[PDB]
């Protein structure tokens, strides 16, 4: 006995050939063949339109990855099973299918807590987010650090691996540039108070140090880029002298109490100051 | 920068409308800045991205469907 | 109150659907459809040919980036 | 699916597809 | 077709224009000079509209470096040009 046999230890079901040619015709673009097979399956009963290929792909998930908007409507005018088919069209950034699915209102790749408004914010589209906020949606609110309610202590001892993921998901959702520039009242002062308390969290949670550390960096380039898009001097004078609730630099002092080293080391901010440190010496272009 | 009048060591021993107009002026600059930033960031993606395998399949499927429909019309 | 509402603070104008299909036909290459919509807009007055999509692109700036 | 580049092999299949399409269409239409 | 490009003043120029505009808008006056100097330094224009294409790159690659000392804000740009 110098040979090694081979076999399958974990078996599953197999499909039939009649079903096979259906899914084979869906993958090639034939429109006159599938439209017949959809019709003979209503007088006779030999095929079920909810089959699944070896890799778990159904007849509606093959027409989404190949962008075909003429077979989707044909499969949708007939009654098919639409499950989590809206989360597969937001990960692959297409626009027509999204609307189209909105208008006709046990295995997956997504955790049971993901919602569409939260998944559309992990990606950074601007046109898809604007379509979901015109309808009413909502995002939960995370508790403060060292909170000691009965909820924070009871759930943290019945399942401790699921409770530590939702906070990370929420904090990844809240920190996207598009949402901050679309739904905030002051887009500059909200990146100062949020890029400072994502770093304290990097000391109590030793497991996700790198993640929290990197999330704290997307909130320091946004303000710099938003600032260096100016085209005149009156715009600079108006911005740097804004006080909420006289004429001194009342907004360049708040950027020093937060340790923002890229917002105060810019050519324009370093040229506005040089004209006040050399007052009384009109020209420094000397030997 | 502040007016302290600090002498050297030896000689050291001897209402609504304004708020409204400011808040009204502060918003247009923000609007314009956001517009320009969004436009620039959308444009920047068009130029510095490579290709992958996904596009080849869509091209093949387009050609296939074109061929099938043309053959259906012409043959019959 | 443990929820966060969301809304738009800086609103702009929106277009109508009739206009929408015009710009949708310009982006696909249909030449026999747009040539009609350009003609009915001279006897009746229902569409303005100087509209602008959400991103500030007009009907002449879409036919330049697609070389037609 | 996401982190792979293209090569020379695909260009040939595309060319052959177009060529066969053209040949069959010309055969049908011409005769 | 007939076109034209403006001419930049010499360094340390002291006319009324160079001192009046440099105190009413100081962020717009410092951009046109950079734009003009980026326009003047292209290979195609020098090889197309110059009489001696070798002696014009000697006298122009020498006075783009002096400008890199009085203008501390755009040092890298002038250095690379
Ligand atoms: Zn908690
Ligand atoms: Zn001058």
Swiss-Prot record, chain A:
Single GO BP term: phosphatidylserine exposure on apoptotic cell surface
UniProt superkingdom: Eukaryota
Ranges: ANK repeats: 16-46, 55-83, 84-105, 112-141
GO molecular function terms listed in the Swiss-Prot or TrEMBL record: actin binding; actinin binding; ATPase binding; calcium channel activity; clathrin binding; inositol 1,4,5 trisphosphate binding
Keywords from the UniProt entry: ANK repeat, Calcium, Calcium channel, Calcium transport, Cell membrane, Disulfide bond, Glycoprotein, Ion channel, Ion transport, Membrane, Metal-binding, Repeat, Transmembrane, Transmembrane helix, Transport, Zinc
Topology Cytoplasmic: residue spans: 1-287
Expressing tissues: Expressed almost exclusively in brain, in mitral cells of the olfactory bulb, in lateral cerebellar nuclei and in pyramidal neurons of the hippocampus. Very low levels detected in liver kidney, testis, and uterus.
Gene Ontology annotations for the cellular component aspect, listed alphabetically: calcium channel complex; dendrite; growth cone; neuronal cell body; plasma membrane; presynapse
Gene knockout outcome: Conditional deletion in oxytocin (OXT) neurons in the paraventricular nucleus of the hypothalamus increases anxiety, impairs sociability, and causes severe hyperphagic obesity, postpartum depressive behavior and reduced maternal care.
Binding site for Zn(2+): 143, 147, 149, 152
Its job: Forms a receptor-activated non-selective calcium permeant cation channel. Mediates calcium-dependent phosphatidylserine externalization and apoptosis in neurons via its association with PLSCR1. Acts on distinct neuronal populations in the hypothalamus to regulate innate behaviors including feeding, anxiety (flight/fight/fear), socialization and maternal care.
Oligomer status and interactors: Homotetramer. Heterotetramer with TRPC1 and/or TRPC4. Each subunit in the homomeric ion channel (via ANK repeats) interacts with one copy of GTP-bound GNAI3; the interaction is direct and activates the ion channel. Interacts with TRPC4AP. Interacts with SLC9A3R1/NHERF. Interacts with MX1 and RNF24. Interacts (via C-terminus) with CABP1. Interacts with SESTD1 (via the spectrin 1 repeat). Interacts with PLSCR1. Interacts with PKD2L2.
Record-stated family: Belongs to the transient receptor (TC 1.A.4) family. STrpC subfamily. TRPC5 sub-subfamily.
Designated name of the protein: Short transient receptor potential channel 5
Source organism per UniProt: Mus musculus (Mouse)
From Swiss-Prot, chain D:
Disruption phenotype: Conditional deletion in oxytocin (OXT) neurons in the paraventricular nucleus of the hypothalamus increases anxiety, impairs sociability, and causes severe hyperphagic obesity, postpartum depressive behavior and reduced maternal care.
Cell compartments where the protein resides: Cell membrane
Organ and tissue specificity: Expressed almost exclusively in brain, in mitral cells of the olfactory bulb, in lateral cerebellar nuclei and in pyramidal neurons of the hippocampus. Very low levels detected in liver kidney, testis, and uterus.
Top-level taxon: Eukaryota
Functional description taken from the UniProt entry: Forms a receptor-activated non-selective calcium permeant cation channel. Mediates calcium-dependent phosphatidylserine externalization and apoptosis in neurons via its association with PLSCR1. Acts on distinct neuronal populations in the hypothalamus to regulate innate behaviors including feeding, anxiety (flight/fight/fear), socialization and maternal care.
Family: Belongs to the transient receptor (TC 1.A.4) family. STrpC subfamily. TRPC5 sub-subfamily.
Quaternary data: Homotetramer. Heterotetramer with TRPC1 and/or TRPC4. Each subunit in the homomeric ion channel (via ANK repeats) interacts with one copy of GTP-bound GNAI3; the interaction is direct and activates the ion channel. Interacts with TRPC4AP. Interacts with SLC9A3R1/NHERF. Interacts with MX1 and RNF24. Interacts (via C-terminus) with CABP1. Interacts with SESTD1 (via the spectrin 1 repeat). Interacts with PLSCR1. Interacts with PKD2L2.
Record's protein name: Short transient receptor potential channel 5
Organism annotation: Mus musculus (Mouse)
Gene (name only): Trpc5
Residues of the full protein shown: 733 to 763 of 975
């Amino acid at each position: 006995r110098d040979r090694i046999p081979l076999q399958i230890v974990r078996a599953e079901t197999e499909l039939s050939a009649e079903e096979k040619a259906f899914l084979s015709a869906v993958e090639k673009g034939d429109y006159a063949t599938v439209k017949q097979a959809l019709q003979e399956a209503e007088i006779y009963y030999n095929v079920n339109i909810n089959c699944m290929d070896p890799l778990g792909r159904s007849a509606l998930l093959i027409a989404i990855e190949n962008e075909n908007l003429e077979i989707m409507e044909l499969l949708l005018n007939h009654s098919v099973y639409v499950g989590d088919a809206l989360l597969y069209a937001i990960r692959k950034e297409v626009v027509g299918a999204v609307e189209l699915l909105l208008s006709y209102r046990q295995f997956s790749e997504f955790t049971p807590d993901i919602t569409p408004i939260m998944l559309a914010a992990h990606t950074n589209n601007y046109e898809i987010i604007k379509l979901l906020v015109q309808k009413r949606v909502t995002i939960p609110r995370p508790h403060q650090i060292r909170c000691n309610c009965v909820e924070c202590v009871s759930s943290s001892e019945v399942d401790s691996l699921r409770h530590s993921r939702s906070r990370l998901n929420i904090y990844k959702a809240l920190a996207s540039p598009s949402l901050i520039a679309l739904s905030s009242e002051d887009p500059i002062l909200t990146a100062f108070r949020l890029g400072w308390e994502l770093k304290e969290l990097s000391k109590v949670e030793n497991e996700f140090k790198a993640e929290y550390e990197e999330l704290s960096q997307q909130c320091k380039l946004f303000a710099k880029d938003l600032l260096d898009q100016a085209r005149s001097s009156r715009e600079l004078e108006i911005i740097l002298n804004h006080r909420d609730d006289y004429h001194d630099l009342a907004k360049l002092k708040v950027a020093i109490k937060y340790h923002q080293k890229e917002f105060v080391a810019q050519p324009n901010c370093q040229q506005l100051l040089a004209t006040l440190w050399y007052d009384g010496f009109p020209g420094w272009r000397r030997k | 920068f502040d007016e302290g009048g600090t002498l050297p060591p030896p000689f050291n021993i001897i209402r609504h409308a304004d708020s409204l107009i400011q808040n009204q002026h502060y918003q247009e600059v923000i609007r314009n800045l956001v517009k320009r930033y969004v436009a620039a960031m959308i444009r920047n993606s068009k130029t510095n991205e490579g290709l992958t395998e996904e596009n080849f399949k869509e091209l093949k499927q387009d050609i296939s469907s074109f061929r099938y429909e043309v053959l259906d019309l012409l043959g019959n």
